[PDB]
Design a protein around this ligand. Structure first.
Ligand code: CLA
Ligand code: CLA
Ligand code: CLA
Ligand code: CLA
Ligand code: LHG
Lengths: 51, 122
């Protein structure tokens, strides 16, 4: 069997599942940016941009 | 014109005060040996401003505009009272009765709701 540190090499000669992995990565990054701004808006206080 | 309830109902015009013609700019003679009365006073608000809270450093609070959320429920009408003629010549209105209050709720930036009793009682 593959060792744990090599599981993602199944994609090397598989252009579509490489594209599918790459799309999922992109989904999680955009998801994160969405989530992170939502938490920032829920905790940001905008009543004083001076101090 | 002489409209009717059925003409007005559900349009929002019931929350509107009457208007005079742009050409109506004469003058009402007042007569010391007479006694007067407001038979109808109507007040229709168009804007609600609320003083923001300036921080512990402050500098100066401005009045910030707000958003009406309670709909076309805001107007004072059918207010009556006598109009005295004073001795220095001035005129004084003394509210007696009418629909002289409306609870209104406006909303500030950031979602603070501010209720108030819009009123001219007494
Ligand atoms: C675009 C970046 C990129 C890409 C696409 C790859 C892709 C690959 N790497 Mg490489 N690599 C990279 C960056 C990258 N690497 C960097 C920056 C380093 C230095 C740290 C390495 C060091 C490295 C080694 C030393 C090895 C690989 C190997 C591999 C292959 C198998 C990996 C696998 O199955 O993981 C399996 C991984 C797991 C099952 C779990 C990993 C959990 C880690 C420790 C923490 C996870 C954190 C969390 C998920 C958040 C992500 C981190 C954040 C930076 C975004 C695969 C072709 C392997 C290879 O050559 O195989 C032939 C291998 O031996 N890579
Ligand atoms: C970008 C992320 C990503 C992507 C696209 C892939 C894609 C792939 N992986 Mg890898 N993998 C990843 C991350 C990723 N993996 C990480 C982080 C690990 C360590 C767990 C692994 C471990 C791993 C193994 C062991 C194997 C694969 C395999 C595969 C393939 C089939 C999918 C599978 O079996 O899923 C398996 C991976 C998962 C189900 C990842 C689930 C991680 C969850 C979501 C973490 C959630 C944690 C927690 C809930 C966070 C919330 C907050 C918390 C505080 C409560 C495919 C090529 C398989 C394969 O065919 O290789 C031969 C395989 O056997 N992957
Ligand atoms: C017309 C030519 C064309 C165009 C415009 C692109 C454009 C792109 N390719 Mg490339 N590619 C091309 C030809 C082309 N490719 C050829 C001929 C090959 C060889 C087969 C490849 C093989 C290839 C691989 C292997 C990979 C890419 C990837 C990518 C994307 C990486 C950036 C990304 O996902 O941004 C983020 C994306 C967005 C903000 C939104 C994108 C929305 C678009 C407009 C798609 C809408 C649907 C559309 C009909 C699908 C076809 C798109 C097009 C790529 C063919 C990018 C959209 C990577 C990818 O898919 O990453 C996920 C990737 O892994 N390409
Ligand atoms: C330019 C930025 C960038 C780049 C180059 C990458 C590159 C990578 N990311 Mg992505 N990612 C990014 C930004 C980026 N990411 C952002 C902004 C987010 C959201 C915040 C994510 C979220 C994300 C997730 C959720 C996952 C990835 C994964 C991956 C890896 C897939 C290939 C692989 O098998 O790695 C092989 C693994 C390695 C080569 C090791 C990477 C080691 C890096 C340098 C981190 C070092 C250890 C880490 C810091 C320890 C965390 C411990 C913590 C619990 C205390 C690759 C290394 C996937 C991954 O690693 O799957 C296994 C995965 O699960 N990334
Ligand atoms: C959502 C977020 C998901 C994050 C997922 C979590 C990360 C996944 C797991 C990563 C941890 C990997 C541990 C694997 C551990 C592991 O399996 O090692 C043994 C393993 C042996 O590999 P072989 O080539 O023999 O393959 C055997 C196969 O069964 C491997 O699958 O070697 C490797 O993994 C290479 C790296 C050695 C790792 C060196 C670690 C030595 C630590 C001991 C020292 C301890 C400190 C004490 C001294 C003071």
């Amino acid at each position: 069997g593959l060792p744990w540190y090599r599981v993602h090499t199944v994609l090397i000669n598989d252009p579509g599942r490489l594209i599918a992995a790459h799309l999922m990565h992109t989904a999680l990054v955009a998801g994160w940016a969405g989530s992170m701004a939502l938490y920032e808006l829920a905790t940001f206080d905008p009543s004083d941009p001076v101090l | 014109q002489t409209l009717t309830y059925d003409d007005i109902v559900g349009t929002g015009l019931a929350n509107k005060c009457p208007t005079l013609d742009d050409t109506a700019r004469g003058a009402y003679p007042i007569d010391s040996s007479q006694t007067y009365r407001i038979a109808r006073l109507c007040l229709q608000p168009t804007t609600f401003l609320v003083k923001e809270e300036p921080k512990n450093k402050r500098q100066e609070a401005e009045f910030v505009p707000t958003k009406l959320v309670t709909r076309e429920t805001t107007s004072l009408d059918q207010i009556q009272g006598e109009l005295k003629v004073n001795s220095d010549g001035s005129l004084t209105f003394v509210e007696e009765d009418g629909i002289d209050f409306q609870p209104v709720t406006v909303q500030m930036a950031g979602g603070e709701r501010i209720p108030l009793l819009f009123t001219v009682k007494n």
